């Protein structure tokens, strides 16, 4: 039996408009100047730029000590401790109507699952009830970027999507068949595929809660409608492929 | 055993006013402007259009632009759902402390998923044709209050496959109401309800 | 099955089970019927969204899956079709009319300003017999991912 200590992050500076700075595994992150897309060089016209925290509490740009990058270990971190797994919680929703066909009306409920354990990223992780440092700690970025497309033509769009902003940081010390590309140092999903037998390929959703309301204006008049507004976080899925 | 690649042949994009005799005694239809789902009762603006299951529109009357997608039956090879998660989330808690939570969706991408191309597996009992031409209804209702609604009705017409339709039909709903400027306060005037492209089948 | 109950009365506060002040608040007031509110509209509803008029003798009684094809882009470290899976329960644990609050107070608020919102809140009237958010950022032509002028966000029938 071993007990791990608490952990935290490094208080850092909010990015400056026009700064392109480098994080680990070669992914560059840029805080663009107006008139540019993701790459900050290809021609766009009308995007102005300011970052955002996970929980809707934005950050003033150019501010020292503005965010703490959250912390999460490997899945089953005790099984990588020797060279604490969170579970889903069932829930019930409010009442709702239905309709039934046959070859009738009935009432049921909706169900969602939640997780709140150590593998969830948090600010100040409590203590948890040998391997090296960088093989057990991460830096999930605690600051996301949020893009605005204002391009002429037809039409303007309200494209609300999110993407991380990775910065290296100093992590506090703790007081106590398989493809090789999975268990190497250059895999961000190392902490997700250290033990899964088979190759892993990613799947990406941006679910869009959209709605259609009442009256509109000309272009195709009547319903002239296409717009999509997504959630506040990309939902990345893993898929196990056979290797033999 | 090993099967091969599966698809079907092409079709003709119908013109508005055509109703061909579909399988199992259902008459699919594509009503004109200002008419209901059996083309007899007038209405203000409930007018119908065709889009792909991806949402791509189809110009009517085109030749060989869509093929009905194909899926496999239940236990022809079955698959287990794929886990996943979103990012950090924060909401309020009651007790008689901020806490970070994550919600978990699912996914399925097996042979039962309708596809353009069928990967092989390791005749009327195994293969089928999903209706790849769906009718998008942009129903509008005026008055006090005012809602617009969308319900999807299938166009189940068959192709040719190379060498009981199957229930609780749930339509999940989304709502949004805009408020502007607050002098005159007679009555609120808006709601909405928007279904999915496909029925949630229990 | 549950007994018939008459509709509540405006401006009336009662005491129910577990020491809670169940009441039907007035316009311009919050749930406590003492704290002022701006422009709220308060009606009474069945637990399934259909309205019940007040002053009704025996107004109500009490209570005791897949989708279709969706395209998803694939990034590997391609176009593919996958579906979404939900869950539901319809057993004895599911409340029903025939074999809980059989009425619910509606709080059809509106908050103005910059940004604005519009909140529909449910508060369970109970005389004995995780919140979903279609969240928003609404503006005419500003920088779309900064502080807006308006929003529009339903809260559902009952938070999970």
């Amino acid at each position: 039996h071993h007990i791990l200590g608490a952990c935290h992050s490094s208080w850092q500076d909010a990015p400056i408009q026009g700064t392109s700075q480098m994080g680990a595994h070669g992914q560059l992150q840029t805080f663009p100047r107006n008139g540019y897309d993701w790459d900050n060089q290809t021609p766009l016209e009308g995007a102005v730029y300011t970052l955002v925290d996970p929980f809707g509490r934005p950050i003033v740009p150019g501010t020292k000590n503005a965010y703490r990058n959250l912390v999460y270990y490997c899945e089953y971190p005790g099984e990588r401790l020797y060279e604490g797994q969170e579970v889903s919680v069932e829930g019930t929703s409010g009442p709702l109507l239905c309709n039934i066909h046959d070859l009738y009306l009935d009432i049921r409920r909706n169900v969602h699952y939640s997780c709140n354990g150590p593998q969830t990223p948090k600010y100040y992780q409590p203590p948890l009830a040998l391997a090296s440092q960088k093989d057990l700690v991460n830096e999930f970025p605690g600051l996301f970027v949020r893009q605005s497309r204002f391009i002429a033509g037809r039409p303007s769009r309200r494209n609300i999507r999110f993407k991380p902003w990775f910065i290296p940081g100093v992590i506090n010390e703790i007081s106590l068949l398989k493809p090789t590309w999975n268990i190497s140092d250059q895999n961000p999903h190392q902490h997700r595929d250290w033990h899964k037998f088979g190759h892993v390929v990613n799947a990406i959703m941006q679910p869009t809660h959209h709605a259609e309301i009442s009256f509109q204006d000309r272009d195709t008049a009547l319903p002239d409608a296409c717009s999509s507004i997504s959630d506040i976080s990309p939902v990345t899925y893993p898929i196990t492929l056979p290797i033999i | 055993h090993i099967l091969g690649a599966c698809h079907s042949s092409w079709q003709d994009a119908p013109i508005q006013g055509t109703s061909q005799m579909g399988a199992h005694g259902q008459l699919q239809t594509f009503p004109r402007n200002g008419y209901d789902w059996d083309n007899q009762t007038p209405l203000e603006g409930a007018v119908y259009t065709l889009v792909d299951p991806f949402g791509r529109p189809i110009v009517p009357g085109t030749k060989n632009a869509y093929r009905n997608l194909v899926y496999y039956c239940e236990y022809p090879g079955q698959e287990v759902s794929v886990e996943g998660t979103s990012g950090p989330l924060l909401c309020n808690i009651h007790d008689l402390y901020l806490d970070i939570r994550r919600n978990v969706h699912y996914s399925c991408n097996g042979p039962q998923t309708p596809k353009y191309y069928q990967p092989p597996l390791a005749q009327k009992d195994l293969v089928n044709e999903f209706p790849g031409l769906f009718v998008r209804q942009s129903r509008f209702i005026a008055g006090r209050p005012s809602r617009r609604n969308i319900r999807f009705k299938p166009w189940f017409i068959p192709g040719v496959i190379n060498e009981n339709p199957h229930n609780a039909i749930m339509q999940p709903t989304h709502h949004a109401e805009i408020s502007f400027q607050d002098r005159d306060t007679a009555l609120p005037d808006a709601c909405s309800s928007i279904s999915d492209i496909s029925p949630v089948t229990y | 099955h549950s007994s018939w109950q008459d509709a509540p009365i405006q401006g009336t506060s009662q005491m129910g089970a577990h020491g809670q002040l169940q009441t039907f608040p007035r316009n311009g007031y919050d749930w406590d019927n003492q704290t002022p509110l701006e422009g709220a509209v308060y009606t009474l509803v069945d637990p399934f969204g259909r309205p019940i008029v007040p002053g009704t003798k025996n107004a109500y009684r009490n209570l005791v899956g897949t989708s279709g094809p969706l395209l998803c882009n694939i990034h590997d470290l391609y176009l593919d079709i996958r579906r979404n899976v939900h869950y539901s329960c319809n057993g004895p644990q599911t409340p029903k009319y025939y074999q809980f609050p059989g009425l619910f107070v509606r709080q059809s608020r509106f908050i103005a300003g910059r940004p604005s919102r519009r909140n529909i809140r449910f508060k369970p009237w109970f005389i004995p017999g995780m919140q979903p958010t279609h969240h928003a950022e609404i503006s005419f032509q500003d920088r779309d991912t900064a502080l807006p002028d308006a929003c529009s966000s339903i809260s559902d029938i009952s938070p999970v």
Partner: antibody
Amino acid sequence: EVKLVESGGGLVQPGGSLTLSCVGSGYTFSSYPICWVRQAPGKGLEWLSCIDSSGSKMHLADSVLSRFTISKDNSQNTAYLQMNSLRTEDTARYYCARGRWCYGVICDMDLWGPGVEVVVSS
Amino acid sequence: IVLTQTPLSLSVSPGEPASISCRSSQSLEEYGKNWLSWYQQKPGQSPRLLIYQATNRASWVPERFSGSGSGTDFTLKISRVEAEDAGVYYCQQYKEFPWTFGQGTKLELK
């Protein structure tokens, strides 16, 4: 810089047929509307003629209810305003504008393009 | 529905606020959904956008704009004008079938 690309106009005899173009850039035109905005010279603005977004509802204005067919192409992002039975009334500079919803109201008639002139006479 | 835009001519001193009333002959509904729009000519160029629904600044140009009103009377307010605010201003709405448009009103600098 992103600019509306408008051309294809000219002097057409009455009763004739002409096809215009509203070409945009910097966006995928997968399911997107197009129409024009009329403006008679020295007169207040007005709207002319559309079909629905994928082409379902064919509703026009009062004076133009049977003379205009509107077509686009979802791939090349090039619009077309095809007219028939040309008359003296509809000579105007046509503007290709942007319209959308922000959870259900109008938030844009965003940028009006260069404008090609259709001056007609018998 | 015909919109009533008044007055046609506005003498605007530079810096002073200006008030323009566009009143609808039909009810534009209530505290949620009183709708209108305001577009502006710039002569020699394409006409552009300055105010939405006579409340807030339509374009992302700076804080110098304002607005108020609801119901049937709508007040077009500006806190402090510029030299580029001249032209003719079109109060507009299309929230009903088949089609409506407004008249327009002119701004003059002094």
